[PDB]
Amino acid sequence: SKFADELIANAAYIGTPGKGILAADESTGTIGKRLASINVENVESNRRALRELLFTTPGALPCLSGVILFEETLYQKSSDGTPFVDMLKSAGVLPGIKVDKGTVELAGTNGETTTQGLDGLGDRCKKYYEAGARFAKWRAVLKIGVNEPSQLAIHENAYGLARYAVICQENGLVPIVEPEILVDGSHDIQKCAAVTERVLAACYKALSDHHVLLEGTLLKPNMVTPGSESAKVAPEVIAEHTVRALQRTVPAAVPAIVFLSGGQSEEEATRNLNAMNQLKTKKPWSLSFSFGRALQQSTLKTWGGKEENVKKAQEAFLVRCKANSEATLGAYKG
Amino acid sequence: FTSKFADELIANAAYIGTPGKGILAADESTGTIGKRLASINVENVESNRRALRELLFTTPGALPCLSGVILFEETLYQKSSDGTPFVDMLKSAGVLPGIKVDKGTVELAGTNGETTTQGLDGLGDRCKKYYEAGARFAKWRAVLKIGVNEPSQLAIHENAYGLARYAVICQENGLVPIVEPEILVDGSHDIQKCAAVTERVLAACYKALSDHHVLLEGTLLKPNMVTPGSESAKVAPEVIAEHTVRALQRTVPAAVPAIVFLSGGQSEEEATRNLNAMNQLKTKKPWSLSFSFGRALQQSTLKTWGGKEENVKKAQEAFLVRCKANSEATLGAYKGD
Amino acid sequence: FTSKFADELIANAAYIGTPGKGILAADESTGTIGKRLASINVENVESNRRALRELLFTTPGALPCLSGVILFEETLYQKSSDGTPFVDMLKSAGVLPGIKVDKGTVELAGTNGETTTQGLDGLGDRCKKYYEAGARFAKWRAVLKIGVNEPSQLAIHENAYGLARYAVICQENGLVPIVEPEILVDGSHDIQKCAAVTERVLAACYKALSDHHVLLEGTLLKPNMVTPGSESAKVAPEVIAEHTVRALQRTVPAAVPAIVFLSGGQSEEEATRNLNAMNQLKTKKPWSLSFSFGRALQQSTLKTWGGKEENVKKAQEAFLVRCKANSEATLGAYKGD
Amino acid sequence: SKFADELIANAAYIGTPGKGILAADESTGTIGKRLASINVENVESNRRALRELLFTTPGALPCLSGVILFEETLYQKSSDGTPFVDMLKSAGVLPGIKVDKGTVELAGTNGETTTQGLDGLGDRCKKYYEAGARFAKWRAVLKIGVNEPSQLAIHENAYGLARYAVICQENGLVPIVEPEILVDGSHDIQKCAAVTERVLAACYKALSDHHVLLEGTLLKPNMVTPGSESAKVAPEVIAEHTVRALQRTVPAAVPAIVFLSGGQSEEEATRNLNAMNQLKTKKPWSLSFSFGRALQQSTLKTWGGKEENVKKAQEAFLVRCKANSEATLGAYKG
Ligand code: PRO
Ligand code: PRO
Prior knowledge:
stress response (chains B, C), alpha/beta, TIM Barrel, eight-stranded parallel β-sheet, homotetramer, binds proline
């Protein structure tokens, strides 16, 4: 691309040790569910207030290399008139943009999906770049079952990610490739390992067929864990299976892997990331975080209303930011 | 994947291929029909777009030659001048309304101007709304070119799987999908090369359709005929027939009921003669060989029409000629003109 | 890829599918024919292997029912008791000699007992030597199973591409390749499942054959009929016919001249009745539907034969019955027995 | 496999810094061409003598983690009655075994090949393991042209390597996967980079579909170079394009990459390897050597006859061994 050098610089930067990505890219719908989750009306006034609370948290932006925004938020102003994107860039945080248009179910499968949003994506990306966005997000969802994920599901999601990745790079956004394997079910960690290995290898083959510049991409995978209905397992076990799965599939050329939290609690996500960064083994990428819920849940709770609870919630948000920052360095302690 | 429309998809796809009938492609965009409308000094206003299509559809004796008409979005909701909805006009004559659903092409990075086709986003809800509007089949055009290194494996793959996913969403919402992998004529290659490329592309298309669990008996194919490139010597209909049918024999399952050829670069008479010769070829052909012609059905009608509505009756005479000729061509019974 | 044998491959593959004829599969290994020879208390010596095959080939009135006989290596160079080379015996009656060329199956690591087929190494020189010996077609058996997660994508791929490479080497050396993706009956699945799996496998096979540039008009297909699993209720011939032919309609190009069904688990009468019903089904079938039967042609002949050569004439009577019945079956003209 | 742990240990060992692989696996035919190349009759007496000269070279076996043998040589004795395989194991060198049965041309391509040898390979491998072999070699050949390598050539060679790899591991031999892209032609280094990237990515996708244990494999690729008819280029340029190509395609899980020399002279091979080991960049595998001709050519010349020329040729063989050893550490100087 004409953006090759800037894609490569920004993707490397996202992976800076001690930093990760906040996912604040919840739709008007999803952020509603979260806003109701603590008895708050889903009005733009409140959507604005929640995101502003996060971004004006005293020690927080230094812990973040990136923030994923929803379209609305990319053009939104803080209360003092400052555009959020300026607020982010002042602190050295790259603004990112969710570009996928949700999932739809594949006929002839058992509730497996493919992700939409290729239509007019190049012109959207260009407009987002002009607005200050420098990376993009697109989520593919795959499930684990008797015959899942199917060859059709894998293929659709891999090549859908690969085509999205190309359009992103043509328009100056570093694509986060996010093939999330859902944790839901009763499978063991070994099964999650095999499936994760299969999916990533299909994804990197797809990315190669599409001539994607790997040094200008990011990966946002699931950690390798037992299913949501299976026994929890220690961080050192998650670490060992996750890192081995990535060693088997993700080229060195990729600069950074920013884990999604999935089912995990705030503390579990942090402890799991931390253990991966304590593992003495070849890891030719930054292992960092791209958390929404695992970074925000305690902050939403403390907040609820406003005023006295802003300062206490900003304290709570800083705790999680600083903990995950520590986790990227293998230096988190309880 | 059974669709809830399986029975109606199968019946309608079979119907399109009724011997003695074919498809009029009147689905050209606001842009393309402009180029055609300017081509005879006519301003591209919806009043004129409406008038051209009305002229075609109200041609006495024409609709009986047509199993289907592909419409552009605008035309699907358009009324004739007398207040008759075009879709009603079509259904009264037994013609199935169809709908172009693709959203154009875009270039693939890292290739030499090869394209992929857009339009999967929100296609299911569009298809459903089109079904409610009277449409019973759909069209999506993938474009492939012939070159030194073309079509590339990436171009083939993107277009095949894009067609396959489109085909599924169509069937889920009750539209028979026309699968249209057009290989463009541009270049200096011979007919043998066009044969090899067409064989490669169709085989990739039917593999993709299988991986997507598409009901083949509820689909249609709209391929290019096999021809020499645009810069090469034109060749007789018997030769086009022999290479085209052999290419289809090698790739298109019997389960597919009808193959409705696109005209592409061809003149009206050349298209008809080519189709006719395919239906005179004594060989296993487990599908109807018919037509889905835009240019090759409309060119002489646009010429005689020109502008004012006292050229209408002479142009409707000219449109009937081409309809009747192509009808004859589906039966191997066309006798020159 | 044009072979220097293209014309002869096309003629011979077409011939195999002559209405009223089919293939005897007498290509069972030294091991398998042992199991059959023990099955009636006969020592597996080459003298007896020779005697069984001689009995078949010298059956008065049998060879006219056969377009082809598949031979094992040993049998291709064997002489009858009167000094007549079997291959000459076959060619005098217009029967093409064929040759099994695969070297058995081996299990795939990381699967649940799925196999891939061996024999590509040195196959071209073997094929050439077999052609020189009088063979004009070849056989290679891939085995796929139906299970919870079977057949796996790896099993399909390995067997499809193994068939495709084999097919090419065959054609380069003048043998029409019989492509034989046998899906085994074992299990409790219903006929619908067998249909879906058979559709998947054949589509992968024809994709592989296309990628390898195989001349389809110079190939044959030897698939399983579509049936319920071995543990499920047997079903009427009309039902086998309808699911089998639909599966073939969805996958096998018209360019393929003949589909010669393997018998698999089926009894003699069941095989014949099943084939017969397929030829009574009024539908697009752009290939000969015929037979390539081993077990289903030989079982009752082995029984009446048993041992000593005064059971020969009664067994040759029994072999003629099955030959004539299957011949009738290719024409849809079998009338029970 | 039942050999998983030993495959992983031996593959890691081949990549020991300061060591590489001698390819002495020339057929009765090929070693003839080499033996005639210096006016020597191709008799077993002489075949025996040449290999013995190499293996009894004073400082040489310590420079080698592996020696690839032909079948004949695996059972051959030295002149003093010592089995070569014992001679190798005493010095800590793993015996390896060429298992492919040559190439054949693919119909409908322009002289592209596929490699034979899957038939009865498991029983061969088992017998070779029993004989002391602990790794295996199989060579796929791909060419660069207008339409080459073709999708058919890539596929056949990738999946042929993947199936060979599996059988090897089932029987305790670490498979060297060798997709050599021939240097022949007028293409530039950028073209060789693109083709090498395409081929390796197809190979690792094939290996994943076949469930190959990557930690128990080796890769033997071409270095990335301009074609044989193009201008030679400096080692630092070969290094930069080669390593980038490997970063884009070869998983970290693979322990070692042992380069084939291809067209290169003895000194050019060494200088090129050396430069790759001087490159400061993520390289999650050993970069070492698997040289036949680039290790042997000067030794064959000095030798010719025997006697006075043995000791001078052993001096010449030690020079090349020590130089390539230095090259694996980035410590070679002229
Ligand atoms: O897996 C994740 O990271 C998503 C983001 C929003 C909450 N959970
Ligand atoms: O590329 C190589 O390493 C081969 C081995 C023998 C000489 N040349």
